[PDB]
Design a binder for this molecule. Structure first.
Ligand SMILES: *[C@@H]1O[C@H](CO)[C@@H](O)[C@H](O)[C@H]1NC(C)=O
Length: 319
């Protein structure tokens, strides 16, 4: 009947979509987001990030996150909660602060414990640490790395686990879906957290790909199995496939094949729990200025009408 029903028949927990609060006043948008034949899971695109949830020190702000949870709850959709520790979308009080190891650890832990406690029981998964690596497999020189060193990562996981022992804890990153220094480094982060004795349940593979340059089904599956071999589940967490503009029939077809292989890779991998697309309509796709010249990244167009990629996904999920 749709993406989510097809995904569940193949043993995934969900097929899902991100959303954001500005979209929720569009009742036509909301009606399709709330269609559980297509979406059994929701991620808040922005309203659970640090800039949204602790915009001034110790000042927790949950209304916009809660509104997304409430919608998911009314619809019977799972939540993925996104994201606790990340160098981007950090309030200036954190990124510019004068810290010591103890004082930044206290503030980071305070952030995690308050946010995760607030959402205790509501989330299938948390992206606990996001994008900790540079493209060359080095640690990003974020405030957390510079002040605390690599321990910030296992400490964040341990802190999340103490606040909510049952939610699945994910390390989430992009450009780790194909082999290379970055994916190798992401494997090493998994091994490092586990060696520290902290709980890590999952690797989140964002899957921001490009039409015509998407990794093959075979390459993607191979890489997923490289993570599951470490004793984690995997999911594609932010899938979209931006195309070099203008859109053409040939690019829409390629885009369909690209989405199909991503779905098929997940369905092929024991321990891949689901796919989330980064919103579902091109009208609300994430295409910031750095990708000027690209667009139309999603399975529905800006008029909420299906593109060939929808059928591609269905084919990849075996329906
Ligand atoms: C910060 O404190 C943690 C917790 O004890 C420790 O693992 C880490 O090495 C410390 N880092 C620095 C730079 O002191």
């Amino acid at each position: 009947a749709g993406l989510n029903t097809a995904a569940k028949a193949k043993g995934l927990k969900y097929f899902g979509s991100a959303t954001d609060n500005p979209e929720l006043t569009d009742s036509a948008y909301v009606a399709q987001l709330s269609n559980t034949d297509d979406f059994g899971q929701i991620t808040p695109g922005n309203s659970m990030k640090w800039d949204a949830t602790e915009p001034s020190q110790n000042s927790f702000s949950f209304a916009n996150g809660d509104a997304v949870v409430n919608l998911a709850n009314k619809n019977g959709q799972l939540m993925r909660c996104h994201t606790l520790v990340w160098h981007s979308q950090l309030p200036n009080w954190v990124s510019s602060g004068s810290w010591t190891n103890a004082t930044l650890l206290a503030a980071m832990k305070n952030h995690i414990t308050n946010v995760v406690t607030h959402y205790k029981g509501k989330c299938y998964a948390w992206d606990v640490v996001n994008e900790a690596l540079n493209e060359d497999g080095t640690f990003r020189n974020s405030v957390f790395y510079q002040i605390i060193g690599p321990a910030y990562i296992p400490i964040a996981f341990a802190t999340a686990a103490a606040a909510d022992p049952d939610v699945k804890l994910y390390y989430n990153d992009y450009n780790i879906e194909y082999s290379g220094a970055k994916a190798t480094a992401a494997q090493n982060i998994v091994k490092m957290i586990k060696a520290y004795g902290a709980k890590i349940d999952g690797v989140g593979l964002q899957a921001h790909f490009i039409v015509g340059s998407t990794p093959s089904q075979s390459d993607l599956t191979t890489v997923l199995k490289g993570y599951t071999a470490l004793g984690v589940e995997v999911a594609y967490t932010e899938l979209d496939i931006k195309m070099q503009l203008p859109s053409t029939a040939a690019k829409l077809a390629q885009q369909s094949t690209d989405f199909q292989g991503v779905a098929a890779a997940c369905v092929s991998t024991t321990g891949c729990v689901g796919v989330t697309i980064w919103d579902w309509t091109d009208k609300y796709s994430w295409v910031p200025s750095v990708f000027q010249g690209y667009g139309a990244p999603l399975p529905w167009d800006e008029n909420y009408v299906k593109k060939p990629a929808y059928d591609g996904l269905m084919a990849g999920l075996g329906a």
